[PDB]
């Protein structure tokens, strides 16, 4: 996260770290959506242009974390993966369309002060909140700058941007399964997700029921925090039918 700040303790208890077993290192962010399901970006697991194709046994999920590098004894919990599900129409070839994946844990994780699931949006909450200018929140342990790394989880609040402005900021073909967020050059404030924040959640707090909803997944961006560029996020609601199908079938 660029131009963010340290998270408060327990501020994002659905935040998950995807951790490579060997070498031991951060792979991506992710989010907890139930006691046995974790949501992330497909490109965290599968990206052939960079020779990336992780299998279940390659990875661990670390839940309840705050420090990036420390083993947070008595606080974090580490889970193994039973199965990875990548969206069948994830477009790694062109534009990261449908950049979404689910991971089923081998065993349910125990909830605690530090570990708790985020909600997924219904159609109405999505329609109400996914509006230009409305702010969401992104969290992660990724780079502090485009080209270093944080001691603890970082957080930044960013406004959703009008679709034509998103489109006009890039040569990539944008789809309805994406949205973009960030400040404009003339707005003064700044901030963005970055490398390593991949797969983490873009959340909004509903003013109707005071619950946090995951509206997006950190997907892509041209560098980080560049003037005139925006961060792109997988549109979770648009892909929720797939999420539900997977959980209903394999849950």
């Amino acid at each position: 996260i660029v131009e963010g700040s340290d998270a408060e303790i327990g501020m994002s208890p659905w935040q998950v770290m995807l951790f490579r077993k060997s070498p031991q290192e951060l792979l991506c962010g992710a989010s907890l959506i139930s006691d046995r399901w974790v949501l992330t970006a497909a490109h965290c697991l599968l990206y052939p242009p960079w020779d990336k194709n992780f299998t279940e046994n390659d990875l661990l999920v670390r839940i309840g974390k705050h420090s990036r590098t420390r083993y947070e004894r008595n606080i974090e919990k580490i889970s193994m993966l039973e199965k990875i599900y990548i969206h069948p129409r994830y477009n790694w070839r062109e534009n990261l369309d449908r950049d979404i994946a689910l991971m089923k844990l081998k065993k349910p994780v125990a909830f605690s002060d530090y570990i708790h699931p985020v909600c997924l949006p219904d159609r109405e909450t999505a329609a109400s909140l996914l509006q230009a200018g409305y702010k969401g929140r992104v969290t992660g342990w990724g780079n502090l700058k485009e080209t270093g790394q944080p001691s603890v989880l970082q957080v930044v609040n960013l406004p959703i941007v009008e679709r034509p402005v998103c489109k006009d900021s890039t040569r990539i073909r944008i789809t309805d399964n994406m949205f973009c967020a960030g400040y404009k050059p003339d707005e003064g404030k700044r901030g963005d997700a970055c490398e390593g924040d991949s797969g983490g959640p873009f959340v909004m707090k509903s003013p109707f029921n005071n619950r946090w909803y995951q509206m997006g997944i950190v997907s892509w961006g041209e560098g980080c925090d560049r003037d005139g560029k925006y961060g792109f996020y997988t549109h979770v609601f648009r892909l929720k039918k797939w999420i539900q199908k997977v959980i209903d079938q394999f849950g």
């Binding site: 408060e8 303790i9 327990g10 501020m11 208890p13 959506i33 139930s34 605690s112 002060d113 530090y114 708790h116 699931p117 985020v118 909600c119 997924l120 909140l129 200018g133 409305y134 702010k135 969401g136 929140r137 957080v155 609040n157 406004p159 909004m204 707090k205 509903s206 003013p207 005071n210 619950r211 946090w212 909803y213």
Partner: peptide
């Protein structure tokens, strides 16, 4: 599920985090 999105150290105790109001204020 039923309890999703309510943080033990914040909503469950009626404590606000330092910047959540920034989100609310944008929901105009």
């Amino acid at each position: 599920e039923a309890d999703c999105g309510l943080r033990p150290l914040f909503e469950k105790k009626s404590l606000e985090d330092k910047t959540e109001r920034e989100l609310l204020e944008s929901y105009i």
